[PDB]
């Protein structure tokens, strides 16, 4: 039905690949002289009325992964695994 | 009488065709202006075949020229015989194919086929009875491979009962003048199995071989490869135009020469081919022409004929002959070569004897033969094809013009079934 569903189809398949251990409130705090905070906002109401694909996966409490619709040299779509480490990765 | 329309597609097509209408003209004795100034009265009886009349004693070939994308326009017009073609026939467009099949069959072919067939129908109804639709095209290219087989999808559609001969120049195992060439052969043989009655497989390597191994030419230019093709093109329709002692139409060949409706890919030969001034050390006789016709270094398809069994062959003899030396030389070859033919056919060779030679020669011939040795021309392409297609190598210049991947697998399935229906009869039983 949706025109852009396929890019999101691999996104729904990636979210079962690794182990989701997210961040829950009440964990210990280490020293961390320089902290880096990254917060993800929730999905707004305008976005679902616009066919919006969530592309910000938060798998850990110190890691955040962003996908991107790309193509191979055979016009074959795949997802780039932008792998970032934060301290402090929020859902 | 029986009349033929000649169509020229691809830039290889009119280059053969411009040399073609010079051999036909000098065979009938006709000047660049179409004025008949021939020697005898015997070559006016079938001007009707190729040259329909005009107002004052002038003759115009029924030559449609699909291929004059304007780089070739003002060379064919500014040529030897640019003042002989009817100028409304020069049908073309702009932005030619680009060695692309999909830009010959789907995008620029669809916006030009209506302007061609509006001239095809105006050259059909100026005729008493048609049988022949000669298409001089070449595989490998652009226009000659996509647009050349778009018209055959339409002309056979509007004429389901005409003999459709297409003198198809084919790719080579070594001479690779086109990088995309295993695509334009697979997608065009898929059209020329379904839609032709006969098609002649001509290669450039076996034309490069004859000009070195036999004719001893120093620099064979492109004119001297077309001068050998055209000597066959005026050798199939000889019995149409000239009286004989055993005539053969374009249909007595294509009923005898073809066993099964898919097995109609021919290899043409010619004899006498030899290299001289005016001192040559031989003698033109009927056993002299015979050994050269069947010789494996005087084919044109660039495959080895002794690798496979000839299904059936046709020897269209010309000149003044004797029918006993014709029917007995064609017998002794079949007995000395009992494995080189198919055992389970009674007599393989047929004979066709006209009575008018070429202009300079005393006798000539034409070996048109249907062989299983042409399995090699289709196995090489089908190995080059599946090498390119496995990586999906050059496909985004074709799927970006409207095609689909499920037409490529359709085309390789059809060519791989010819090799299956050639390996069978090459085997013994």
């Amino acid at each position: 039905g949706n025109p852009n569903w396929e890019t999101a189809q691999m996104i729904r398949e990636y979210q079962s690949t690794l182990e989701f251990v997210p961040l829950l409130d009440g964990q210990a705090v280490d020293d961390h002289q320089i902290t880096v905070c990254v917060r993800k906002r929730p999905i707004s109401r305008k976005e679902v009325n616009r066919k919006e694909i969530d592309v910000i996966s938060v798998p850990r409490k110190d890691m955040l992964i962003v996908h991107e619709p790309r193509s191979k040299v055979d016009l074959t779509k795949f997802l780039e695994n932008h792998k970032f480490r934060f301290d402090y990765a929020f859902n | 009488m029986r009349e033929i329309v000649h169509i020229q597609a691809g830039q290889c097509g009119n280059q053969i065709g411009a040399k073609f209408w010079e051999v036909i003209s000098d065979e009938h004795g006709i000047d660049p202006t179409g004025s008949y100034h021939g020697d005898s009265d015997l070559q006016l009886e079938r001007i009707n075949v190729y040259y329909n009349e005009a107002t004052g004693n002038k003759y115009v070939p029924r030559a449609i020229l699909v291929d004059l994308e304007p780089g070739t326009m003002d060379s064919v017009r500014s040529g030897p015989f640019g003042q002989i073609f009817r100028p409304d026939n020069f049908v073309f467009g702009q932005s030619g194919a680009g060695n692309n099949w999909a830009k010959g069959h789907y995008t620029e072919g669809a916006e030009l086929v209506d302007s061609v067939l509006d001239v095809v129908r105006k050259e059909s109804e100026s005729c008493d009875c048609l049988q022949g639709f000669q298409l001089t095209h070449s595989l490998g290219g652009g226009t000659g491979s996509g647009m050349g087989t778009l018209l055959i999808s339409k002309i056979r559609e509007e004429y389901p009962d005409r003999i459709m001969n297409t003198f198809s120049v084919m790719p080579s195992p070594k001479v690779s003048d086109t990088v995309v060439e295993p695509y334009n052969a697979t997608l065009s043989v898929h059209q020329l199995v379904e839609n032709t009655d006969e098609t002649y497989c001509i290669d450039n390597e076996a034309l490069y071989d004859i000009c070195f191994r036999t004719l001893k030419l120093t620099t064979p230019t492109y004119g001297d490869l077309n001068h050998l093709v055209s000597a066959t093109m005026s050798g199939v329709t000889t019995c149409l135009r000239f009286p004989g002692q055993l005539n053969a139409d374009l249909r007595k060949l294509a009923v005898n020469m073809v066993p099964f409706p898919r097995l109609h890919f021919f290899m043409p030969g010619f004899a006498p081919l030899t290299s001289r001034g005016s001192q040559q050390y031989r003698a033109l006789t009927v056993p002299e022409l015979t050994q050269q016709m069947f010789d494996s270094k005087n084919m044109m398809a660039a495959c080895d004929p002794r690798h496979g069994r000839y299904l059936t062959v046709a020897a269209i003899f010309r000149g003044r002959m004797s029918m006993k030396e014709v029917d007995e030389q064609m017998l002794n070859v079949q007995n000395k070569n009992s494995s080189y033919f198919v055992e389970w056919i009674p007599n393989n060779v047929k004979t066709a004897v006209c009575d008018i030679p070429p202009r300079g020669l005393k006798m000539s011939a034409t070996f048109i033969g249907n062989s299983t040795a042409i399995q090699e021309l289709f196995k090489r392409i089908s190995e080059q094809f599946t090498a390119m297609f496995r990586r999906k190598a050059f496909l985004h210049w074709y799927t970006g013009e409207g095609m689909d991947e499920m037409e490529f697998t359709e085309a390789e399935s059809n060519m791989n079934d010819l090799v299956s229906e050639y390996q069978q009869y090459q085997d013994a039983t």
Binding site: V73 | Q94, S176, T178, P182, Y208, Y222
Partner: protein, 441 residues
Amino acid sequence: MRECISIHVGQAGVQIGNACWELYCLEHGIQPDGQMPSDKTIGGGDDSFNTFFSETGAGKHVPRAVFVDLEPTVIDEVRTGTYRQLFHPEQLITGKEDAANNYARGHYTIGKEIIDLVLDRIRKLADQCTGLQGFLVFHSFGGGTGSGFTSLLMERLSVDYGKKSKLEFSIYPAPQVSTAVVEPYNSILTTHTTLEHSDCAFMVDNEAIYDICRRNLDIERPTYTNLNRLISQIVSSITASLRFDGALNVDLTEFQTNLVPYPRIHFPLATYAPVISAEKAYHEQLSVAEITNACFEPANQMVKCDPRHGKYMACCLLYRGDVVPKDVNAAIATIKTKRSIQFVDWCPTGFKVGINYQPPTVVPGGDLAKVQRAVCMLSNTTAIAEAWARLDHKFDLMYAKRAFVHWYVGEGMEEGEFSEAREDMAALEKDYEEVGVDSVE
């Protein structure tokens, strides 16, 4: 009639345009004031072909050329030189300041507000032509307007024209000799729009043509006048089939079909056969097998790039002059025998021969002379990937130190643009590692 629109950009593009249009006017017979007094003696022929020359009713001829450089100093040589009255007087200068060697002044600051004169001038020029189009773009990587302003000119011409063929002839930074210290920054930001929009990117280089001007031509001190003529001889025999009468003509659409396997590996590394001296114009046969074997040795590649450390994918031998088509296949079955000239499995066809038979002419004033035949081989090899890794390494060595970058982000561009151009070139170099490696079963 088929035609091209030659759009020079930058100082490198305009300086090459001094000599590309010097060559065209001598072949066809056009004087530096538009007339054609050569064919007036014979009285026939339209030899000022409409591929490159608009014709007005007063006998004068006007080229298809427009060039923008954002600096008056370069074009005021053209507006006062010998070719003053030839070109149309809209040679777009209007830059109140030079780009100053960055991509951000550039694609954003002063490239904008001057582009409005540019696109409307092309529309006033493209709508005088019926048939084939092709944008012959001329610029250099590394510079300011050749990198920045071309990048704005491609995304604004891939929308108003769509699917037209764009042959852009870029001068690439040499791995050993660089005339700027910020040239590794510009030649990685210009790839992000060369890869997307321009369908075919002819890369040449300055160091690999310095050795050709020293070894073969035997010129000890080659100035920029003597380098741009060798690119001009190459650009002539790329667009020679659009003009002259050949035995196998190759259209600009026939490049796209043959040279380019995948939509992002279009970088084909031109060559030539410039072994004229002209003292060595004697002493040497220069046959078809001789000039075709000039592409064997890596001392005649136009890019500092060793083809023996990589595969080939597709080549395009384009001849000139007295070439017989038989002699070509002798010089090709030879090359398919030599085992260091290495192909991939997936391209068994290899080559493609375009035989034009008009001989290349001689610009009077040096430095080569009248040879009877030539060749401009165009072959996208896998070896160009090692020519980029010696430029990503120059980018990465001064990206860890955050050098030179406050003049890039302080001109409108974001500092995140650099890693977006690194993730292409890391992934585009990754593409050449897959294509050269065959699959096993």
